[model samples]
Target: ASESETLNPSARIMTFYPTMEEFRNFSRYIAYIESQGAHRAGLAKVVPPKEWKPRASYDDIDDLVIPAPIQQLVTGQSGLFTQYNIQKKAMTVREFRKIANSDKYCTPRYSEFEELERKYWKNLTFNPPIYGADVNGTLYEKHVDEWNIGRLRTILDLVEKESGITIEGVNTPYLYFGMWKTSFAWHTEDMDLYSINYLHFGEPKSWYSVPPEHGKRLERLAKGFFPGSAQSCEAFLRHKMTLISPLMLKKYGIPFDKVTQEAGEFMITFPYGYHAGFNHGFNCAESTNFATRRWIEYGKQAVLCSCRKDMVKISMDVFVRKFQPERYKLWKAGKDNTVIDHTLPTPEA
Candidate 1:
């Protein structure tokens, strides 16, 4: 499709070459972010104190938050998993996968899944549908391959070079992140993306606006609504529309426009404007895999964490240490950060 007609749920994939003024503004923004000290929040949950806690693990956070759109899904009421009410039958993952891959499941959209939940899960006598480890495990394997190492690696490399820091991991490089398929359920990184080495890999497909009726609910669902809901102190519709629309690019405005580029591979930086993925393709799957990194600072600047010469030197050192084969044995038990299996590519300096 032509650039103008390249309409997808993500709007249009457009690239901009920042002019001198834009570059200046971006430099200023980066300085501000650096001053903030990425660990400002330390290990706090991104949401309200009552709803979520500080230092919550990924699964813990997920258990706590419910999306406004999908609230009914977990309310033990009208939900997709509930209606299917497969919990009682206790089918294995193989069976579940068989069902999920079948024509019956093929036609089952989100709404249909909700319908099944309402019909069955609400009246079920026991736990929810639990697929076997093999099938469920396969999902994680696929996720790792597609998300972490694919387009995600592309963006991470770019961000590392531009920001002059090394971010670790693809998801939750910091603290929290928003989920797409589920309700408006969202989470925030420990601090802002600007202050630390963090990255999020996934499409920001869902849009959220705050109409008075459900404004608060949306906030409760996704605390990472910084750039959107935080902008519209008045309505949720604008927030919702902005959330799903390319308005995220607009909400963060100058910062987003600054970081993203059209030319050679490079990092796209934006504090509150970090998102990837969309539901606009033949298979209904489109995702952006990007990572963010920040330097370690000792609480000096307020916004800009600490990317001075010393910090940058440390950051690069850390990257080399972490990625270097010498350090891999020490970084994690058996985890190899880069997909390059040493065997293929010689570890040349």
Candidate 2:
């Protein structure tokens, strides 16, 4: 798409060149799982992208083991899993493979998948989803190297280590398995902090983002659709998929941008910038939130937003008192106040 055809928002996609060995290792892990008959659970209750509602929840959705022959099932031409509701019944890799290889199955069209991408959302498991294994666990050391959090070097990491204050959910990293229509709804990072996502492998993930300036307007628009959404950003969470198309945004005169993040690429979302998107197909990705010197102000503002909604959980006031001075010093020195050489002191210690 031409640059003019797309809205220029605060989100940007950057390329990350992974070592051949690193790339191969991830691919191999997927292959190994497929070969081992390992079954991973995936969300069974999926709705068509068009049927997505703003406030619906799938808490009751059951999990199904994805078919064992994952790679083959995803690449098959059969329309066996084409329908929105039918695909919602999480298929095991082997189950899907069985159907795909059957005579009744034919190759599924990209258009069929695209249509779903335009309308639905599904959640899939990532073997080692957030919170790595404990140090004593067998895979703990290996996870330390395989997870993207270990490789990332960002200002947020630095601040967290030096300030000794960890924002409960902000610093946690997440591993995501993106299927044909899996998606995330419109929202900003928690505490309006910055977030970075890396696509490990498979098809590209599509994204739509709005700049911070347009955030309030977007929220107003969202509230118009779901009246109860006026409470807080969390109110925008929908049990049904909420697809905010680019054309819809243009018609409303909201500035936004669109991008397709490919494998081995990084997508960064700035503070208060609204974003939503879906996986083009089967893929694995990981992301984590971080805060920089400039993020402090927004963090404070977010705290107020939370307060107004009576959802104040973490005290940014306490965080500011503890970390602002260190942030200022680092900003003034114009140096990377990277991770310090100290461990968090435990109360017992």
Candidate 3:
């Protein structure tokens, strides 16, 4: 299909419902996964605290690492993690720079960010201008290419037969994930690409999405919502206009449609929507991740364009952060980014 044809449906977004066979294949895949790792079933059951202690208190921010009572997610432990200013307790570009430059921290803590900056100022020698070093366990482009080649070929074949959008370059869809466990905190992402995301596996919660138009509102509210602030807890309550609730979405004037999942199956999609996950009352930390929203500009683009297909990998540190349990729950619950729980038995049997 032509670009115009794809862009024509801007007012409405459609997730092509998987056919029964596709669903069965997905189910079988889940079953195979569960057979290999039955112990890691359910969002609550799968994510466990890391056995190894972090090397520095500087890296012990709630999102990055927490004390004994806190839980660390298995995926969050693997990806590029964020380190916020615990002393200031606000995430800012300045704070990010400061923490990255500190020598007291370990290579995992801030070296990843600092190295990227050094590369940028030294001259954009890096193929991806934003990130210079591949710290934080990120795979380089060649490896990423190898990993996604088969998936890309399949997607291309589907597009050619069904949609007929000529697939040119490889669009690397990646899951950038994070977790938070606090009542309140500020987090932000760079406006690099359109991102599709979802709360795939977790207990029901709310999330607040403060769009770019409300940047100042977020900044002001963020100050009041900082830890220990007298008005922190009430900030969300007061700014109901900015909040979206999954439980009572109709009351907020935002329109949403539910996509049901079979029991024991978990998947959700997000695109270009900045969001925060709220923990509610559960001990479970929420799992939220983003992929390329959708591709556009080349073939067709929209205000909500698909994410760019280019391989725009970052320092992983530069691109992602962990969510605090308390903060994550509040954002999820507050923003209406909650996923439906089907209570299906995990794909163990």
Candidate 4:
């Protein structure tokens, strides 16, 4: 590996630099990234070609507004990571950016501070779910029209496109406004589907991930730390309540990969990969879950998670009968696809 690489080749998340043509024909490019073993870490980043940037104007956002989720961070607590909260403020992008870029709010990992000191700023501001006929509904549509993000016709979009059903946040893209330590907790895509996120602009996002192979160990480690919650909900990890560091995961003998995402970059989280991360500062991102034909098996075999009961779980049986005929072949025989036991025998290291 050359010194020019994003991070040290030893531990950095694999990065891709796709040409405009390669980015346009993205599904083929995805398979190439998967072939590079990003699946094991469950994460990869792409520095998109400069020519692929969006041409849409965000001038309407001058007076636009949305409620931002404000998580409260209590540093040095023996308790669970952070307590989250929300507030509805009519804050302008200009005003929000002032606070977002302010060092008084949060300290980034790259700053001249001790690692532990940097952890103090883990909680930050985020405006979630800009989907539907909402104000930012066209935000993602802008990308699809100007760039190839949505037009890439990923396998992930097959069901929604065909049936005209909107699986908001699953198939429908969601927009995010992130600031210092704006974090996403450990979780997988809905029904173990593939998911992708794009950093439109602003500060970098630091990402952490565990491959599907280590899925059980990751859960066990979380359970060991927060046994009460694990008992309360078998899928507590999916709740996004927990936040552990890569250092801590390593201390507990679990493997993780890290990535620093900057502007004009995209991150893809493969099926069943657990990812968690925080933003460096103020930025914008658009994300959505997708499924390839290969994901049909996982979604079909997947039992409903310990859901929060927000969105109705997609009935894979109905989906198979309605969408994928052959994937339902095993079901027709009164047989099941491979059972994904959330836990079982550990993988030999």
Q: Any runs in candidate 4 off by more than 4 Å, and if so which?
A: 1-12, 56-60, 73-82, 87-91, 106-152, 161-163, 318-329, 332-334, 337-349
Model 3: how far residue 33 lies from native, Å? 25
Candidate ranking under lDDT, highest first, comes to: 4, 2, 3, 1
lDDT of each: 0.25, 0.45, 0.26, 0.62
Expressed as tens digits, the lDDT of each residue in 117-199 for candidate 1 is 33332333232222211111011223332222222443235345566544332221322222212222122221222222112
lDDT digits (tens) for residues 100-193 of candidate 2: 3343332224465455443332222211111110111011123344434433444556545665755433555555555454556567776676
TM-score of each predicted structure versus truth: 0.25, 0.52, 0.26, 0.79
For TM-score, candidate 1 versus 4, the one ahead is: 4
Best by lDDT: 4
Task: Write one digit per residue (lDDT tens) for candidate 3, span 1-349.
Answer: 3222321222121223333443334224333332332211111111112231112222232243211121121111111112222222224323333333344211222244334223222321111111001111111233322112213232223334444433222233322112212221223322222222222232233333433223334445434423343234423222211222223333433333322222112333222223433221211221222222121111121121123334222222111113224344444344424332112123212
Identify the leading candidate in terms of TM-score: 4
- lDDT measured at residue 185 in model 4 versus the true structure, 0 to 100: 73
For each candidate, how many residue pairs have backbone atoms clashing (under 3 Å)?
44, 18, 43, 1
Error of 4 at 51 (Å): 2.1
Better of 1 and 2 by TM-score: 2
In model 3, which runs have C-alpha deviations exceeding 4 angstroms? 1-202, 210-271, 281-349
Question: Candidate 3: TM-score?
Answer: 0.26
Candidate 4 global TM-score: 0.79
